[PDB]
Amino acid sequence: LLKYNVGDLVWSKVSGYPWWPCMVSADPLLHSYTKLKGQKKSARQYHVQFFGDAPERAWIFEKSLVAFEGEGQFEKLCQESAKQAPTKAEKIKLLKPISGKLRAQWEMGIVQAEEAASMSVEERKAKFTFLYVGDQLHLNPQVAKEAG
């Protein structure tokens, strides 16, 4: 019984990065969207797209995913992440807001993710799925137009 499917929106937590808005999707080369790392039931991964103007994709462990509703969740995510931060500087980094080009990308991503959330599964899959030209990842022409 899978928690997510292609088109579902999630927040992803990767070490060294803030919680990021994402959408579960199929890996363009592997053609799967979920896997068991080492065939262990506890190490399930999902393939996700990271929302923003500079797109990326990755296999993220399900344990590092929280279903996405909106930016309102973000404050509590940082708080829960800082609660178990093994350092005070590590807790300061998590509670402090995002800066630089990363902030710009994160806000762009929140704008696309909240639009995707207001859409149905098939509408958001048709609009936000990355277009792949051989080995190049491109943003959907419409999404690229709305970003820049």
Ligand SMILES: Cc1ccc(C(=O)Nc2ccccc2)cc1-c1ncn(C)c1-c1ccc2c(c1)OCC(=O)N2
């Ligand atoms: C999966 C990935 C691939 C490559 C890179 C990468 O290139 N990182 C890097 C770090 C320092 C200097 C230069 C490059 C980061 C991630 C990455 N891991 C976790 N998160 C949250 C991301 C990520 C961060 C920002 C955006 C993003 C994804 O996608 C949409 C977008 O506009 N911004």
